[PDB]
């Protein structure tokens, strides 16, 4: 099945894409994110390893794009990297989620390009608070050094590291949020309001929190969001009231903060559980989602309701069928419109750009 779809994808790449690059990493990555700086041009990616042994690393890769893929640095990491995210105000600083439940902070510029063969991990900060590992990880883009994390322990932790010397120290969570009653799968700050953030969990809820509230056990809003676990959310960077959630129910839901009683839209086409959803960094109507069905779907909300001649609803702009295994993470390139990096369980990293005629 997979093998037949893939053969058909390969034949069609020149008509569906302006760019496709494929690279098989040594070990699969659970995480992917484009760093914001660009020096053809040179772009960089934060990646991690997931191994059957003890050779784990935080990884920075370089990618040459029209204006090859190489490992620039590996940094010893304690166990697999569940997720890694750079701090928007200083992208030398990367947070990572470890299986032990610690969240680690690295300044990658402080490390040798070849990792220490001893295998020792030497993080610049070790952030304590969780009793279990997890995935959700989010830096506040309006308040430097405030980091949210979501865990399988049912909690969200918040740290404020802005006054802490990055000299190897342990920092406890400033606040712990306890409103969910099951694994918290994802957490994200609002992109314009420094006090607001969302969380989603296996209790099927989206919660909206306000850090100004004295009550850490009850959010400002609690939304019955999906008919199964909610794995990811993303706030729209250009539309202050709009956000999206993705779920084991196979849908992405669209929400408005002004009235969360009613879902705005349900984007339906995935055939299996969704793990990631991200808004386009360039276009306010554009989002993407990926997961267990090995597909990455790109949606355009300006097309909801449009007359068609179907293969899918009109808001489905593009299905990326290049991966042949579950997609673990993906990232929109913030410097070259429509370029995405996606990574899958079978070690494949793809860097691709759909054909201009599709969105044009």
């Amino acid at each position: 099945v997979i093998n037949e779809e893939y053969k058909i994808w390969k034949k069609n790449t020149p008509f569906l894409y302006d760019l496709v690059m494929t690279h098989a990493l040594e070990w699969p990555s659970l995480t992917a994110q484009w760093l914001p700086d660009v020096t053809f041009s040179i772009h960089r990616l934060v990646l991690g390893t997931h191994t059957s042994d003890e050779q784990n690393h935080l990884v920075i890769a370089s990618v040459q794009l029209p204006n090859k893929i190489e490992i620039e640095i590996k940094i010893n990491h304690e166990g697999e990297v569940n997720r890694a995210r750079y701090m928007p105000q200083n992208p030398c600083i990367i947070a990572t989620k470890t299986p032990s439940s610690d969240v680690l902070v690295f300044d990658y510029t402080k490390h040798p390009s070849k990792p220490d063969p001893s295998g020792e991990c030497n993080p610049d900060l070790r952030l304590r608070g969780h009793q279990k590992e997890g995935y959700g990880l989010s830096w506040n883009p309006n308040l430097s050094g405030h980091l949210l994390s979501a865990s399988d322990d049912h909690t969200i932790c918040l740290w404020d590291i802005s006054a802490v010397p990055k000299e190897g120290k342990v920092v406890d969570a400033k606040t712990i949020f306890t409103g969910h009653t099951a694994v918290v799968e994802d957490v994200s700050w609002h992109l314009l309001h420094e006090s607001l953030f969302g969380s989603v969990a296996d209790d099927q809820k989206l919660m909206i929190w306000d850090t100004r509230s004295n009550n850490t056990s009850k959010p400002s809003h609690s939304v019955d969001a999906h008919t199964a676990e909610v794995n990811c959310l993303s706030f729209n960077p250009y539309s202050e009231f709009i956000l999206a959630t993705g779920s084991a129910d196979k849908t992405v839901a669209l929400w408005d903060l002004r009235n969360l009683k009613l879902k705005l839209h349900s984007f339906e086409s995935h055939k299996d559980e969704i793990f990631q959803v991200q808004w386009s960094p360039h276009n306010e109507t554009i989002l993407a989602s990926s997961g267990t069905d090995r597909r990455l779907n790109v949606w355009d909300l300006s097309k909801i309701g449009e007359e068609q001649s179907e293969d899918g609803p009109p808001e489905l702009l593009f299905i990326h069928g290049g991966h042949t295994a579950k997609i673990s993470d993906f990232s929109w390139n913030p410097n070259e419109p429509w370029v995405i990096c996606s990574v899958s369980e079978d070690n494949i990293m793809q860097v691709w750009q759909m054909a201009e005629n599709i969105y044009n």
Partner: peptide
């Protein structure tokens, strides 16, 4: 034990 990661990742050397 977490359902979100496969239990047996494979190396490509």
């Amino acid at each position: 034990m977490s359902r979100r990661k496969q239990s047996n990742p494979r190396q490509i050397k």
